[PDB]
Amino acid sequence: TTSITDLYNEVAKSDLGLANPLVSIIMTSHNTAQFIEASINSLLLQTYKNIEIIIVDDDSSDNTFEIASRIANTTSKVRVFRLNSNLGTYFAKNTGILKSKGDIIFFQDSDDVCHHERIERCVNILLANKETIAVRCAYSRLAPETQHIIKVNNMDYRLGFITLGMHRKVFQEIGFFNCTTKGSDDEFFHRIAKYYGKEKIKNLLLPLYYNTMRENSLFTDMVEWIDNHNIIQKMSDTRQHYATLFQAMHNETASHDFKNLFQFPRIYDALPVPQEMSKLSNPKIPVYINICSIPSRIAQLRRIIGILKNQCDHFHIYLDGYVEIPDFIKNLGNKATVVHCKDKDNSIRDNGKFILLEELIEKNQDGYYITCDDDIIYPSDYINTMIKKLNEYDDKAVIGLHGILFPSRMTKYFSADRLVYSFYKPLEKDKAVNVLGTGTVSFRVSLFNQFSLSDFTHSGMADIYFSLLCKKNNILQICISRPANWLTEDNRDSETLYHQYRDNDEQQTQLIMENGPWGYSSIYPLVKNHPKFTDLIPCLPFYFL
Amino acid sequence: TTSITDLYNEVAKSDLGLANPLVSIIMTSHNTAQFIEASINSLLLQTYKNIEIIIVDDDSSDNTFEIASRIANTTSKVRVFRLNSNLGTYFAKNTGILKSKGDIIFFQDSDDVCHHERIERCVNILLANKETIAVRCAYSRLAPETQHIIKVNNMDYRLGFITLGMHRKVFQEIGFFNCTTKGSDDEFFHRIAKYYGKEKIKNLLLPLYYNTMRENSLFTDMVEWIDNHNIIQKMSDTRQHYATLFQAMHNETASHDFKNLFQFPRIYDALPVPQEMSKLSNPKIPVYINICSIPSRIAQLRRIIGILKNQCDHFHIYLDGYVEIPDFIKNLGNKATVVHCKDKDNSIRDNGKFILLEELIEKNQDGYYITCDDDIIYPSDYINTMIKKLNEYDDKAVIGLHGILFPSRMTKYFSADRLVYSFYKPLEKDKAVNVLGTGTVSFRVSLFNQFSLSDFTHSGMADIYFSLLCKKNNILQICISRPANWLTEDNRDSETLYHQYRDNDEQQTQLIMENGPWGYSSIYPLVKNHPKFTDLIPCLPFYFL
Amino acid sequence: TTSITDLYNEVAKSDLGLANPLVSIIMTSHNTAQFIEASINSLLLQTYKNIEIIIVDDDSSDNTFEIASRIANTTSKVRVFRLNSNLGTYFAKNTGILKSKGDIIFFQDSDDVCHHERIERCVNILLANKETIAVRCAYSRLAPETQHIIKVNNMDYRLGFITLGMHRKVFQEIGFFNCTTKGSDDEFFHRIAKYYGKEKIKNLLLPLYYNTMRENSLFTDMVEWIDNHNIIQKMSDTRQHYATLFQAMHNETASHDFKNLFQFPRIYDALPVPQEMSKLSNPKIPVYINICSIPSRIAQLRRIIGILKNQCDHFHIYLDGYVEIPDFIKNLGNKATVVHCKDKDNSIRDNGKFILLEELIEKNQDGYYITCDDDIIYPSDYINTMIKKLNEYDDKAVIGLHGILFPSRMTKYFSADRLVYSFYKPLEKDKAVNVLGTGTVSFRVSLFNQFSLSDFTHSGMADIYFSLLCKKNNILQICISRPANWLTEDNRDSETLYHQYRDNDEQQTQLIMENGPWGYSSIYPLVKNHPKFTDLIPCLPFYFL
Ligand SMILES: O=c1ccn([C@@H]2O[C@H](COP(=O)(O)OP(=O)(O)O)[C@@H](O)[C@H]2O)c(=O)[nH]1
Ligand SMILES: O=c1ccn([C@@H]2O[C@H](COP(=O)(O)OP(=O)(O)O)[C@@H](O)[C@H]2O)c(=O)[nH]1
Ligand SMILES: O=c1ccn([C@@H]2O[C@H](COP(=O)(O)OP(=O)(O)O)[C@@H](O)[C@H]2O)c(=O)[nH]1
Ligand SMILES: O=c1ccn([C@@H]2O[C@H](COP(=O)(O)OP(=O)(O)O)[C@@H](O)[C@H]2O)c(=O)[nH]1
Ligand SMILES: O=c1ccn([C@@H]2O[C@H](COP(=O)(O)OP(=O)(O)O)[C@@H](O)[C@H]2O)c(=O)[nH]1
Ligand SMILES: O=c1ccn([C@@H]2O[C@H](COP(=O)(O)OP(=O)(O)O)[C@@H](O)[C@H]2O)c(=O)[nH]1
Ligand SMILES: [Mn+2]
Ligand SMILES: [Mn+2]
Numbered sequence A, B, C: 001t002t003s004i005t006d007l008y009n010e011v012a013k014s015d016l017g018l019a020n021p022l023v024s025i026i027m028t029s030h031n032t033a034q035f036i037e038a039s040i041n042s043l044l045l046q047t048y049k050n051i052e053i054i055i056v057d058d059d060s061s062d063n064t065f066e067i068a069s070r071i072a073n074t075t076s077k078v079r080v081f082r083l084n085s086n087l088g089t090y091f092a093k094n095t096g097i098l099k100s101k102g103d104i105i106f107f108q109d110s111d112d113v114c115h116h117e118r119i120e121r122c123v124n125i126l127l128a129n130k131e132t133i134a135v136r137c138a139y140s141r142l143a144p145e146t147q148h149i150i151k152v153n154n155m156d157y158r159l160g161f162i163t164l165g166m167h168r169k170v171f172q173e174i175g176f177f178n179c180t181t182k183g184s185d186d187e188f189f190h191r192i193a194k195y196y197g198k199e200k201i202k203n204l205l206l207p208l209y210y211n212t213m214r215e216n217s218l219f220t221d222m223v224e225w226i227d228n229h230n231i232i233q234k235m236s237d238t239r240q241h242y243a244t245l246f247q248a249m250h251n252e253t254a255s256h257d258f259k260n261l262f263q264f265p266r267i268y269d270a271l272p273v274p275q276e277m278s279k280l281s282n283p284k285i286p287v288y289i290n291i292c293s294i295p296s297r298i299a300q301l302r303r304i305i306g307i308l309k310n311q312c313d314h315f316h317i318y319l320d321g322y323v324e325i326p327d328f329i330k331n332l333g334n335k336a337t338v339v340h341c342k343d344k345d346n347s348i349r350d351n352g353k354f355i356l357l358e359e360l361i362e363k364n365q366d367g368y369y370i371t372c373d374d375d376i377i378y379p380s381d382y383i384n385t386m387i388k389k390l391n392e393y394d395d396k397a398v399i400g401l402h403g404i405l406f407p408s409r410m411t412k413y414f415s416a417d418r419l420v421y422s423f424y425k426p427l428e429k430d431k432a433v434n435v436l437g438t439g440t441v442s443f444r445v446s447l448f449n450q451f452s453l454s455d456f457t458h459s460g461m462a463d464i465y466f467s468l469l470c471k472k473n474n475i476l477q478i479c480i481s482r483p484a485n486w487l488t489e490d491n492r493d494s495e496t497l498y499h500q501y502r503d504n505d506e507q508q509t510q511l512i513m514e515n516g517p518w519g520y521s522s523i524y525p526l527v528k529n530h531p532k533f534t535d536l537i538p539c540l541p542f543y544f545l
């Protein structure tokens, strides 16, 4: 019986793979707290010093993210991000690609560990020939208990797709990985072969990767057990249907169109796959994203477009004070509708984020209304996470990230008697709040039957007026959970309305005092009247009235 | 807000429903230990004294069956049976119908309770008119915590199908319930309406039944929550597909053919339903049932036919000593192949149960070979349970119910050094045994490549020779778990081979001693070489060598 | 490293131990479901055929008792009893001694297994010399995972006390094991050595017993770990205090007094041990046992004395119809007070069981009033279990075993509308009932402030009147859980009041109808007003009013 010691001896015996561009290794973690620390330790022991480790957590329920954050704090080579919703391993891979900075991209699962010479040999093979575009090395299956080799199809090690590494420019020419639960690695490899060519891919018959064999994994549907050291891997019915789906799609679609087909981030499936094969939100109604922008943050706005030009079906951009329409907005074409009020006296500032909503009231077009601010950096999984949370709450309540909770006895809105859960600050559990910041508000349009923008008497107070509108229709506001620094604020030394109205909040205080009650008195009746809000019931609501 | 006290007041206010044939109330229990005792107490409090309560347990993982057995021991009106595999509520209902003795059949779920005057009123309405064939009464949804009414479609109580009660002769004219996970009650009600007529069904607008609203139930797919007292019930996509499936089937099939279409017990779906809608085994290969019979137990054989004439695709009956072919065997037609050796000297007795197996070796026809004895009463879920257990073990081992475990140092086969787990005795957990009784052996035919009946030198020792054949091919024998008295032995004062060879087991002892090793020494290598057998590893195998 | 295979080889190599009196092996089980089946299998494989296996379950919370009952049903050599309260291993050993029938007694823990030749060799050594009174054999510690030997004090096997076996007459001359949690085996062995002599004990230096080393066991307080194969066993502070306690007690007490010091069953500690070393009830108030007896069951009464003459501080026996005081009652002396009303017309029958209670009302003597009937066989742990249950409920409610639950709409007491949980029938969970049978009622005297026997107008209806008294003072009646056949009824073809008043219950029906309400209407207010009764809240009490 061949063991992993034999694999290491064979790797050391072979001389294959023997400037230094930055290499980004992207790890995907999901409830793998037992193995992620070992995986990161194995990645940090690589002989290729000029590396960085981008780790993406697919909304783990265990302390995987805590271990990843601790290791990222120990050393500067590890940068860790967490997805607030479970979207599969390939969405995390694409997010890591977006967050990466190196010219070469490699992959490694969190539950698996790699040889301490994998990246060096793979980079040497990749850069040996200029025309080479990608390199892959053989992997193997191991039992974590006995450390023996789980032979697959009567072979110790076989060429795989998780070990495939390529240049950074590959993902900007043929798109990114297809956002599916499983089987997207084969599709991406075949896409590379169709676009560049089979001669552009290098193969390294060395067991440089070690897939840990654990139960209830993604590929267990392909496993037929013969004994403790031999398994048979055959594609399932859904996997075969997916495989036949894209092979015909590769032939029926031009290669240069691939960049226009698999754009990331995305919220719709690029291929007709069943629900059990895709973990994307896949909304059944059009998605509208509304955002207001001032010129002083125009560059930030561009970045938002670079993260939201594909995560919606329609845009509503309110340019407040702009002189001319920016190029990145007019490039969207009919997808974006722009409000270009050039007068500050007649301007409505943040209230423009609700303009399209009024039109939907006159059209009864169901959708997922999203409101965003131009000073917030949004992640690649923001829209999918918001839609998933809305579906989890059955679209019966408005959700947000910037939560504000104040009692009904408060005499000053910006006093110390309010509690603020910022969008860039972590939240362990979902909490119902009185006021949600409109920069992170997502809600289904069908929740509101009648709405008019003229009810928003004062500009710059969108949060208070939106909370009043939600309270009038008895619609709950939920501050959903999120990891630390999920939405990193980017002020960039600009002017903010918080600094302007922090010491001059007379109108906000008047509205809060005149439109009570607040606190849990406005939450407990709404949270006690629905089973889906049972986990959101306040613990001791007798003081926070 | 209407409460259950208002429902009881309305029931007491209405005078509707005011000889005594035996009435059988059939309860289906599955992980409802918190409510089954209350349900049985409610059924025992009915004013209709001449009742019996047939309870069927759908392989509960909690102590539901223990409570049911205790209550059945307390009083003679309760008879409890347990299905060894989970086959849905309607399979349990049909099993209760088969086990019932009353002329009128009523139903009540284990998680629900009924008014103490439901059965009396329903029977009075049913027997008020001679032409009446079935009666149903309105039900309601209740929250177990607050005891309030969960209104469905803005109505306090609505007519249902679980409360439908009919005569015993109904199930023998249009078949039984369709063996599906859910939605079969509507299909059965529409079948009754199509066959007899809408005028033959009586409706009682009284809340005589109380469906407890608990999470993760079967009908939660139809529930859309509005508040804590109002829900909307709409059929899902799969439910709608099933509903459209049988409505056309009712029109496209003659009424008198229904008896030939929904025969129970069955192992194949009568309608093209998806896997998520049917909990039957649904084998992809033909099922062969093999049985030997002597004339002295001929009546018992008939009963076996009455429970197995539809649970297979082919029969192999070995008539040992019979004078003429019985009517109930020749009525099967080409479905049954009969071996009618009339000479006792040339007879092979139980070895005939393997004759068809040899033919399959010459034909390579994959299937589920089942061996049965004529002195054992089999339940309605026997074949489905065996196939489900085989699929759980991935068809990699032979399963049985009569287990025999003896050490390798044994000097007499029928001595006190062997441990016997009889088929009529309960077993808490699956255990791998050395010898499985051939009267309860089920195995996939593909596990054996070469087999000849001539290897069975001596007759009446089928268990030992079959165990030797399994050990030669390294095929594990597993004594699966079963409840108490799952297979009630029916000797009926006949002659048994155990009494004949108990004091004259020279050949069996010779074979056991000559074909070692036995005990865990013949089990531990087989149980340590497969993950699916991990739960079957012996605890302390150092003494049982 | 020595292994268990070496131990078996050494046992087979040694010839030591090579009529057949009945030998009873007593097993104690407590949450050892993983090993009890293996232990019983090892005991059934012993070469000494003439054996019986008495198993006592120390109120296991897992399915240990289910496995034991199944194995006891498989073969006639296994008899299983369950203690309803946890009283330690030595109380179970003494109960097994009382229930045993053999002339020789051996012991074996449920978590441990023995060699298949231990009992034969031990019996041969014991009966080799007539003057021999007990034999012990060396034991060893084993790891259940690796099956290696856990050396204790740098020795593979050492002489122990669990393996000690002796004659049946030993326990009737020097009493039984001291009812402590641990360390009582050493005390019993030293007691035997002090009484008979060191020459009367035989030692067998053979590893015939295998103590499984599992965490959180009783002797883990003595274990200091050095490595995976070596431990150090040293007595703890409490163990040393207990050891010094009885060694002086052996010298300061006459040998013939031992029989009068360690009588079993008992409810008080024979030695001043701390609470953490004794699992007995140890009441702080005198215990009074009250029982009525008719001559037709006089022999049964004697048996009750044989099980209750030491489980109390005072007796109150009401002889109804007796001619002369029986010898076994007058032998108790001042411990028993007898009421000898010779007139049937002036007799009160079962009401005499409360006579002493009235006296306590005139004396304010706190205690644990116990009422018993002469037709019920009581176990050796009955009083301890009742006192433990009362302490668990903080002495705030009356407990019993014969529970009766009927609705408030019942028009006949002995009709089919009542539910009876008999004392000889199992109950999975404690249930509050309307009426508790006075033959199994245990309650603290301080719960009642004023009581007069004249309130019991009619004789033979003690249950109804006692339930009325409990309801008047708002004292809950709880039918505690018990295993199957915990109290085996012994009618012995006598006359019972149930048969007399089954068809003539006019007075009982009148009292029940005149002293309502009943059912959960009389239980829910009492069960909702105390946290200790939270687990006793009815599930769906809206029908059982
Ligand atoms: O829904 C999921 C399942 C898995 N993973 C991660 O994706 C990687 C690959 O999944 P898995 O280990 O199941 O792959 P396999 O070992 O089955 O090939 C692992 O790091 C998982 O933590 C994920 O992000 N989302
Ligand atoms: O005159 C203005 C100032 C701001 N904004 C927009 O209003 C939103 C909220 O402003 P800000 O970030 O200052 O609010 P804060 O986060 O300070 O509460 C942002 O999208 C700004 O682009 C606007 O439309 N007009
Ligand atoms: O797989 C299952 C699910 C449920 N049941 C039983 O069938 C009855 C009806 O199911 P359920 O209570 O879910 O029905 P609902 O209340 O959802 O209408 C209950 O007694 C369940 O214990 C069953 O036998 N098998
Ligand atoms: O001469 C005989 C006696 C019995 N049998 C069949 O062999 C099986 C096993 O026989 P039996 O029930 O006596 O076996 P036991 O249960 O006593 O071991 C049954 O199906 C019998 O019908 C048979 O074919 N020929
Ligand atoms: O409170 C208890 C603890 C243990 N035991 C049983 O008494 C025996 C001896 O206890 P243990 O196994 O802990 O002894 P050790 O192995 O520690 O010497 C076992 O069969 C236990 O199940 C018992 O009856 N009551
Ligand atoms: O004339 C009588 C009949 C009975 N008993 C006692 O009353 C108790 C209950 O009687 P029984 O067992 O007949 O009651 P059942 O169990 O039938 O309800 C027993 O201790 C009997 O000894 C009595 O004192 N006098
Ligand atoms: Mn993996
Ligand atoms: Mn801002």
Ligand SMILES: [Mn+2]
Pocket: B109, B111, B112, B211, B212, B217
């Ligand atoms: Mn239900």
Ligand SMILES: [Mn+2]
Pocket: B373, B375, B496
């Ligand atoms: Mn038989």
Ligand SMILES: [Mn+2]
Pocket: C109, C111, C112, C211, C212, C217
């Ligand atoms: Mn032990």
Ligand SMILES: [Mn+2]
Pocket: C373, C375, C496
């Ligand atoms: Mn009695």
